[PDB]
Curated annotation (Swiss-Prot), chains A, B:
UniProt gene name: Gria2
Glycan attachment positions: N3
Name listed for the protein in its UniProt record: Glutamate receptor 2
Modification Phosphoserine, positions: S150, S184
Annotated positions for site Interaction with the cone snail toxin Con-ikot-ikot: R64, R148, K240
Provenance organism: Rattus norvegicus (Rat)
Lineage: Eukaryota, Metazoa, Chordata, Craniata, Vertebrata
């Protein structure tokens, strides 16, 4: 039948999607700003469709409950037909790839370590060997799953450490993880995706730092319901945007062009 | 009908696929060794299929002739039904994605600069600003296309320089590009994918070096004919291998474990 406005599901997480300071004076998609907001506009332009940016109701990303087997977050909204496409820093993982379609990566990243400047830690191995400096991750998401399911000695030990550490080394949000690193006087290292780490390292008060190399290598992908008709075009749009150097420009814009740390 | 042995098309290019020193005494897939040979074994194991490693007849990777519109290389073998899957460092590009299916990236890379140690060059911008130190790429492939189609000022200038430079700054093979850098006493810089660059930097006589950051960000993908039944399983296998840390181990094995430069 007739074309329909594409429902885009995303989530508020800086600097990917944020409500403009003057959002109360704007409307529709114009209320938001950020890397993903810009990416969505570019994808829509190339694929030639109108869209509406919506915020995922449950505020989750994409995990399936072991008991009920129900998918939450943006993945769930695609799986159950609540949204047509998800545009956010959604990590491409096996479990998600099995239920929805992912475009090729629009951003490359890996799990990294965030420390307050001055902390005597240079790698994950360094962390695994001690307990004075506590370390944890988000209480849900791809990074936590990485450690939970890892069979690699170092990461396996880090996981066992994390589950038994007191007080809890887990945080509910990125802002919480960042704030804990900053207020813990060097006694807390935060494991998060390099992208977020690199972003925070350029924000005042400039007291955090990304150390060591990434623990893994992966990417963020645009997701659509399995078999969806938009899948193909969106995937080609992603590759096109990357080849035109558009994606690198968007990262620079939201990560470095306005860096606040020199 | 009954399952059939999967025909895998690949190409001799170190350290991805090479004929063993004692190949004349071995048979079938055992005649070859390398990163891709190992990857193929792992993919086949996870997807549960028997396969035969074959070498692409025309020795090309995957480009379409503008006049005849015929696809050459491994892409062509998939497009015309000569092979069931291609396992090699095949760069995921828009033009190829339009005719065949790619798995998510099994390796992340970008175009980089290779120089003989001592060369006064730190970036592509540095190269673009001069002509004393000649610079070029392979006479075909993704890297050449990157420069040919680029609209980015610096890369556009580099391309115009390359097309008009005398003698020709292009090479036919990686080994040729490497050899030219080594024998040109610092008067030749070679533009190639970071993966090959990092590999060569660890091989005797240890006289080359990778300088500056990558010009772009992309990946290598396993390819299958569009709509192929193996596509799904192979894609999930790739993600699984990466999540198990298997892909990083394979890179270490063929790139660094035996590094010859300290
Ligand atoms: C910001 C959040 C909660 C997301 C972003 N990508 C990951 C995901 O898609 O699971 C999560 C971060 C992480 O796991 O470190
Ligand atoms: C080694 C060769 C000729 C291949 C490997 N990947 C690229 C491709 O798939 O086109 C080519 C290298 C390059 O373009 O620098």
């Amino acid at each position: 039948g007739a074309n329909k406005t594409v429902v885009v599901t995303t989530i508020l997480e800086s600097p990917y999607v944020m409500m403009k300071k003057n959002h109360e004076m704007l409307e529709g998609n114009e209320r938001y700003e950020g890397y993903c907001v810009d990416l969505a506009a570019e994808i829509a332009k190339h694929c030639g469709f109108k869209y509406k940016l919506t915020i995922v109701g449950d505020g989750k990303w994409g995990a399936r409950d072991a008991d009920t087997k129900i998918w939450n977050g943006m993945v769930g909204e695609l799986v159950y037909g609540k949204a047509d496409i998800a545009i956010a820093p959604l990590t491409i993982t096996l479990v998600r790839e099995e239920v929805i379609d992912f475009s090729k990566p629009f951003m490359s990243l890996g799990i990294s370590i965030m420390i307050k400047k001055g902390t005597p830690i240079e790698s994950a191995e360094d962390l695994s060997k001690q307990t004075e400096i506590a370390y944890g991750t988000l209480d849900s998401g791809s990074t936590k799953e990485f450690f939970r399911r890892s069979k690699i000695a170092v990461f396996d030990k880090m996981w066992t450490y994390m589950r038994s550490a007191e007080p809890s080394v887990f945080v509910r949000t990125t802002a919480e993880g960042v704030a804990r690193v900053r207020k813990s006087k060097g006694k807390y290292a935060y494991l998060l995706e390099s992208t977020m780490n690199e972003y925070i390292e350029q924000r005042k008060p400039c007291d955090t730092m990304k150390v060591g190399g990434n623990l893994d290598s992966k990417g963020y992908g645009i997701a659509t319901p399995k078999g969806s008709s938009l899948g193909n075009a969106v995937n080609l749009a992603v590759l096109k945007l990357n080849e035109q150097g558009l994606l690198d420009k968007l990262k620079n814009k939201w990560w470095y062009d306005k860096g606040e740390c020199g």
